[PDB]
Design a protein around this motif. Structure first.
Motif, PDB file in Angstrom:
ATOM      1  N   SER A 226      35.642  29.736  40.912  1.00  0.00           N
ATOM      2  CA  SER A 226      35.827  31.056  41.581  1.00  0.00           C
ATOM      3  C   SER A 226      34.530  31.775  41.916  1.00  0.00           C
ATOM      4  CB  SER A 226      36.759  31.915  40.767  1.00  0.00           C
ATOM      5  OG  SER A 226      37.931  31.201  40.431  1.00  0.00           O
ATOM      6  N   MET A 227      33.755  31.189  42.807  1.00  0.00           N
ATOM      7  CA  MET A 227      32.461  31.791  43.207  1.00  0.00           C
ATOM      8  C   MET A 227      32.144  31.390  44.643  1.00  0.00           C
ATOM      9  SD  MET A 227      29.902  31.729  39.951  1.00  0.00           S
ATOM     10  CE  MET A 227      30.592  32.042  38.327  1.00  0.00           C
ATOM     11  N   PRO A 228      33.058  31.684  45.596  1.00  0.00           N
ATOM     12  CA  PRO A 228      32.898  31.227  46.972  1.00  0.00           C
ATOM     13  C   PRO A 228      31.826  32.001  47.751  1.00  0.00           C
ATOM     14  CG  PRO A 228      34.930  32.536  46.781  1.00  0.00           C
ATOM     15  CD  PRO A 228      34.278  32.488  45.412  1.00  0.00           C
ATOM     16  N   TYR A 229      31.470  33.208  47.302  1.00  0.00           N
ATOM     17  CA  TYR A 229      30.477  34.057  48.013  1.00  0.00           C
ATOM     18  C   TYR A 229      29.089  33.479  47.740  1.00  0.00           C
ATOM     19  CZ  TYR A 229      34.606  37.002  48.499  1.00  0.00           C
ATOM     20  OH  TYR A 229      35.859  37.442  48.803  1.00  0.00           O
ATOM     21  N   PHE A 230      28.750  33.309  46.462  1.00  0.00           N
ATOM     22  CA  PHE A 230      27.507  32.641  45.993  1.00  0.00           C
ATOM     23  C   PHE A 230      27.252  31.358  46.796  1.00  0.00           C
ATOM     24  CE2 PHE A 230      26.034  29.470  42.570  1.00  0.00           C
ATOM     25  CZ  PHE A 230      24.722  29.527  42.987  1.00  0.00           C
ATOM     26  N   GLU A 231      28.187  30.408  46.762  1.00  0.00           N
ATOM     27  CA  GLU A 231      27.996  29.048  47.346  1.00  0.00           C
ATOM     28  C   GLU A 231      28.051  29.121  48.880  1.00  0.00           C
ATOM     29  OE1 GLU A 231      30.789  25.803  46.037  1.00  0.00           O
ATOM     30  OE2 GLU A 231      31.893  26.528  47.828  1.00  0.00           O
ATOM     31  N   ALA A 258      34.764  40.310  53.990  1.00  0.00           N
ATOM     32  CA  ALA A 258      35.937  40.697  53.164  1.00  0.00           C
ATOM     33  C   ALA A 258      35.477  41.171  51.788  1.00  0.00           C
ATOM     34  CB  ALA A 258      36.894  39.541  53.008  1.00  0.00           C
ATOM     35  N   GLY A 259      34.577  40.405  51.166  1.00  0.00           N
ATOM     36  CA  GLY A 259      34.114  40.616  49.779  1.00  0.00           C
ATOM     37  C   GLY A 259      33.013  41.655  49.696  1.00  0.00           C
ATOM     38  N   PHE A 260      32.239  41.838  50.767  1.00  0.00           N
ATOM     39  CA  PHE A 260      31.215  42.911  50.846  1.00  0.00           C
ATOM     40  C   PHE A 260      31.951  44.255  50.871  1.00  0.00           C
ATOM     41  CE2 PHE A 260      27.519  45.340  52.150  1.00  0.00           C
ATOM     42  CZ  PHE A 260      26.464  44.644  51.608  1.00  0.00           C
ATOM     43  N   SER A 261      31.482  45.201  50.057  1.00  0.00           N
ATOM     44  CA  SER A 261      32.126  46.521  49.838  1.00  0.00           C
ATOM     45  C   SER A 261      31.056  47.603  49.703  1.00  0.00           C
ATOM     46  CB  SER A 261      33.013  46.493  48.624  1.00  0.00           C
ATOM     47  OG  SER A 261      32.236  46.528  47.432  1.00  0.00           O
ATOM     48  N   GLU A 262      31.506  48.828  49.420  1.00  0.00           N
ATOM     49  CA  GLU A 262      30.648  50.021  49.201  1.00  0.00           C
ATOM     50  C   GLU A 262      29.446  49.614  48.337  1.00  0.00           C
ATOM     51  OE1 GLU A 262      34.051  50.081  48.607  1.00  0.00           O
ATOM     52  OE2 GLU A 262      34.294  50.164  46.423  1.00  0.00           O
ATOM     53  N   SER A 263      29.699  49.023  47.161  1.00  0.00           N
ATOM     54  CA  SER A 263      28.692  48.727  46.103  1.00  0.00           C
ATOM     55  C   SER A 263      28.110  47.318  46.280  1.00  0.00           C
ATOM     56  CB  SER A 263      29.273  48.891  44.717  1.00  0.00           C
ATOM     57  OG  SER A 263      29.655  50.239  44.467  1.00  0.00           O
ATOM     58  N   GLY A 264      28.480  46.609  47.355  1.00  0.00           N
ATOM     59  CA  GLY A 264      27.864  45.332  47.775  1.00  0.00           C
ATOM     60  C   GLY A 264      28.832  44.163  47.720  1.00  0.00           C
ATOM     61  N   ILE A 265      28.359  43.000  47.247  1.00  0.00           N
ATOM     62  CA  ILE A 265      29.168  41.752  47.080  1.00  0.00           C
ATOM     63  C   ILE A 265      28.730  41.016  45.808  1.00  0.00           C
ATOM     64  CG2 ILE A 265      27.732  40.049  48.227  1.00  0.00           C
ATOM     65  CD1 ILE A 265      30.182  38.790  49.422  1.00  0.00           C
ATOM     66  N   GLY A 266      29.689  40.430  45.087  1.00  0.00           N
ATOM     67  CA  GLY A 266      29.433  39.582  43.906  1.00  0.00           C
ATOM     68  C   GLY A 266      29.386  38.104  44.260  1.00  0.00           C
ATOM     69  N   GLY A 267      29.079  37.250  43.280  1.00  0.00           N
ATOM     70  CA  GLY A 267      29.115  35.784  43.448  1.00  0.00           C
ATOM     71  C   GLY A 267      30.486  35.351  43.927  1.00  0.00           C
ATOM     72  N   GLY A 268      31.514  36.058  43.457  1.00  0.00           N
ATOM     73  CA  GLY A 268      32.920  35.853  43.839  1.00  0.00           C
ATOM     74  C   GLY A 268      33.777  37.048  43.436  1.00  0.00           C
ATOM     75  N   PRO A 269      35.041  37.107  43.907  1.00  0.00           N
ATOM     76  CA  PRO A 269      35.989  38.112  43.427  1.00  0.00           C
ATOM     77  C   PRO A 269      36.224  37.889  41.925  1.00  0.00           C
ATOM     78  CG  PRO A 269      36.793  37.001  45.422  1.00  0.00           C
ATOM     79  CD  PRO A 269      35.644  36.179  44.877  1.00  0.00           C
ATOM     80  N   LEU A 271      34.096  39.044  39.783  1.00  0.00           N
ATOM     81  CA  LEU A 271      32.721  39.418  39.364  1.00  0.00           C
ATOM     82  C   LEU A 271      32.376  40.764  39.983  1.00  0.00           C
ATOM     83  CD1 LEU A 271      30.999  35.957  39.979  1.00  0.00           C
ATOM     84  CD2 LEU A 271      31.966  36.845  37.847  1.00  0.00           C
ATOM     85  N   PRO A 272      31.591  41.605  39.279  1.00  0.00           N
ATOM     86  CA  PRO A 272      31.126  42.862  39.851  1.00  0.00           C
ATOM     87  C   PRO A 272      30.080  42.555  40.918  1.00  0.00           C
ATOM     88  CG  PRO A 272      30.075  42.504  37.731  1.00  0.00           C
ATOM     89  CD  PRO A 272      31.043  41.358  37.942  1.00  0.00           C
ATOM     90  N   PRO A 273      29.672  43.556  41.730  1.00  0.00           N
ATOM     91  CA  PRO A 273      28.571  43.367  42.675  1.00  0.00           C
ATOM     92  C   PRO A 273      27.267  43.029  41.948  1.00  0.00           C
ATOM     93  CG  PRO A 273      29.864  45.312  43.253  1.00  0.00           C
ATOM     94  CD  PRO A 273      30.322  44.870  41.876  1.00  0.00           C
ATOM     95  N   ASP A 274      26.433  42.183  42.560  1.00  0.00           N
ATOM     96  CA  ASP A 274      25.114  41.789  41.999  1.00  0.00           C
ATOM     97  C   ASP A 274      24.070  41.862  43.112  1.00  0.00           C
ATOM     98  OD1 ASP A 274      26.333  38.900  42.724  1.00  0.00           O
ATOM     99  OD2 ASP A 274      24.156  38.670  42.563  1.00  0.00           O
ATOM    100  N   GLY A 275      22.806  42.056  42.724  1.00  0.00           N
ATOM    101  CA  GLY A 275      21.659  42.229  43.641  1.00  0.00           C
ATOM    102  C   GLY A 275      21.335  40.951  44.401  1.00  0.00           C
ATOM    103  N   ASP A 276      21.563  39.794  43.776  1.00  0.00           N
ATOM    104  CA  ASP A 276      21.221  38.474  44.365  1.00  0.00           C
ATOM    105  C   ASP A 276      22.049  38.257  45.635  1.00  0.00           C
ATOM    106  OD1 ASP A 276      20.054  36.046  44.754  1.00  0.00           O
ATOM    107  OD2 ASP A 276      20.362  35.348  42.707  1.00  0.00           O
ATOM    108  N   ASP A 277      23.378  38.357  45.512  1.00  0.00           N
ATOM    109  CA  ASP A 277      24.348  38.105  46.610  1.00  0.00           C
ATOM    110  C   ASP A 277      24.310  39.255  47.616  1.00  0.00           C
ATOM    111  OD1 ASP A 277      25.857  35.556  46.040  1.00  0.00           O
ATOM    112  OD2 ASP A 277      26.371  36.634  44.184  1.00  0.00           O
ATOM    113  N   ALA A 279      21.618  41.068  48.253  1.00  0.00           N
ATOM    114  CA  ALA A 279      20.322  40.818  48.925  1.00  0.00           C
ATOM    115  C   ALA A 279      20.321  39.474  49.660  1.00  0.00           C
ATOM    116  CB  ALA A 279      19.181  40.860  47.939  1.00  0.00           C
ATOM    117  N   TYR A 280      21.441  38.739  49.702  1.00  0.00           N
ATOM    118  CA  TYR A 280      21.579  37.530  50.568  1.00  0.00           C
ATOM    119  C   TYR A 280      22.699  37.694  51.598  1.00  0.00           C
ATOM    120  CZ  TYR A 280      18.106  33.927  49.599  1.00  0.00           C
ATOM    121  OH  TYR A 280      16.949  33.205  49.566  1.00  0.00           O
TER     122      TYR A 280
END
Length: 489
Positions: A226-231, A258-269, A271-277, A279-280
């Motif tokens: 469950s990490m389709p945004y990361f990959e 879809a996964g990008f939001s107010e507070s950003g995007i996580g590695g996947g749904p 997961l909370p938003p993270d700076g890595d994803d 910032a990519y």
């Protein structure tokens, strides 16, 4: 039949099966065997655990053995067959051999929730294998934190959704706490088959998820899910540098959107938003004409550095590399240094994390080749060209040239196509800038030709979840980018 055509074929298939492809782990197989009850399946995991065990009786990559070795023996001690106790006997004999030596046990690698996984398994496996003696006590191991969360769970008080990733550390899970848990829209509890197992043992979406996870490889359990945004973001952010004129699936674009939001995007749904994803997502968005906002990224900025996660125990060096790359690209494209302040400060911070040997490491991938090549892309286009920066970059390159092997490749230990593709990638950016060293950077790359076109070697697992793994799609693209660099020299 082109690699270009292949990436385009990969990109279409990625949009078809958004199911994430992380390599199996002895830890995750080891915990799944112990927890998925009534033996829906048991022997398939057993066969996989015995073939991957190392001659010395241990599991894992050299210096990351404890968490996997404890995981497997816990699995093979639960509920035997041929060579199982032989495995269990020789594994445990080689564990006390180290816990009884110079300095005792090597410090815990900073693999996900080592702090908890290790105390939990030794309490449970203490009572299992207190025999095979004539205690362990890992230096980074925090039993205090383990027992704390244990009784927080039993009191039915909520736990950070980050520990939902490693519920299998709390083996007998009480039901009143399991009722707190909700799995994602794909059947996974916070990206981990063995944590989902712990939830279940204490349902359609979740069974389908566990059906696929116990089938993909014949029983061996994928280390995480469950990490389709990361990959997606890592694949797309390498297609955009080394494969322009390969057509990106829209359906993949909209998926990020879809996964990008107010507070950003996580590695996947889940997961909370993270700076890595975040910032990519931004960077790929920019490169593709999407309206992108640095304002969101600044939300992952702390005092001196961007954070993977707003609660940062230990920080991440690739997150700052990945964020600066985006800020450099925006300043070069937009023509204004809008984040002039953060660029320089993040640049300062990146430099002060370099080791005396010239390379970087990272929280998220454990080969300096990932971290060094990333920090080097960020720094070459960093606005100021301070001596700190060019002396930094001067040492980085030097490191890169001196560690090439006879095979033509590079590696934190044995050479590999992922780590070779990182070095050759970092060298290309040097060669294409010019000046002292630049021509030795290119020769170095011409020498990588042989390593790549040579054997179909295997991908060691360098990425860091609860244990190490290969994110196959991401590593599939990296190696081909290395080759594309290589087949230009």
């Amino acid at each position: 039949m082109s690699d270009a055509d292949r990436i385009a074929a990969l990109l279409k298939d990625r949009a078809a099966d958004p199911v994430t492809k992380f390599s199996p782990s002895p830890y995750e197989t080891g915990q799944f065997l112990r927890i998925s009850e009534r033996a829906d399946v048991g022997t398939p995991q057993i066969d996989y655990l015995l073939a991957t065990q190392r001659p010395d009786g241990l599991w894992g990559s050299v210096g990351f053995e404890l968490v996997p070795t404890l995981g497997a023996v816990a699995g093979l001690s639960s509920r035997d067959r041929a060579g199982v106790t032989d495995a269990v006997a020789r594994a445990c004999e080689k564990l006390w051999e180290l816990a009884l030596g110079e300095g005792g046990l090597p410090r815990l690698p900073d693999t996900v929730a080592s702090e908890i996984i290790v105390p939990s398994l030794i309490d449970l496996l203490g009572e299992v294998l207190q025999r095979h003696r004539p205690f362990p006590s890992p230096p980074g191991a925090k039993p205090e934190l383990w027992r704390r969360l244990s009784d927080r769970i039993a009191r039915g008080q909520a736990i950070p959704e980050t520990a939902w990733h490693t519920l299998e550390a709390f083996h007998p899970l009480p039901e009143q706490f399991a009722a707190t848990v909700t799995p994602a829209a794909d059947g996974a509890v916070t990206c981990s088959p063995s944590s989902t197992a712990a939830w279940v043992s204490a349902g359609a979406s979740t069974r389908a998820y566990l059906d696929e996870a116990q089938s993909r490889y014949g029983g061996a359990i994928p280390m995480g899910s469950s990490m389709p945004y990361f990959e997606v973001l890592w694949v797309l952010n390498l297609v955009l540098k080394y494969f322009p004129d390969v057509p990106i699936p829209r359906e993949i674009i909209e998926e990020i959107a879809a996964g990008f939001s107010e507070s950003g995007i996580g590695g996947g749904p889940g997961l909370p938003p993270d700076g890595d994803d975040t910032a990519y997502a931004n960077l790929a968005g920019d490169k593709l004409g999407a309206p992108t906002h640095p304002e969101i990224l600044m939300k992952f900025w702390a005092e001196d550095h961007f954070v993977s996660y707003p609660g940062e125990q230990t920080p991440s060096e690739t997150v700052n590399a990945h964020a600066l790359e985006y800020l450099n690209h925006l300043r070069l494209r937009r023509g204004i240094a809008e984040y002039g302040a953060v660029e320089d400060a993040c640049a300062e911070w990146v430099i002060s994390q370099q080791t005396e040997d010239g390379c970087w490491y990272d929280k998220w991938n454990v080969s300096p080749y990932y971290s060094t090549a990333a920090c080097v892309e960020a720094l070459l286009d960093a606005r100021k060209q301070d001596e700190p920066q060019l002396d930094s970059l001067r040492r980085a390159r030097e490191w890169l040239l001196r560690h090439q092997t006879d095979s033509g490749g590079w590696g934190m230990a044995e050479p590999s196509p992922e780590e070779t593709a990182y070095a050759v990638m970092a060298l290309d950016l040097f060669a294409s800038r010019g000046g002292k060293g630049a021509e030795e950077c290119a020769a170095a790359i011409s020498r990588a030709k042989e390593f790549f076109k040579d054997e179909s070697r295997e991908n060691p697992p360098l990425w860091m979840g609860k244990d190490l793994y290969t994110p196959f799609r991401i590593v599939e693209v990296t190696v081909m980018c290395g080759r594309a660099v290589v087949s230009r020299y």
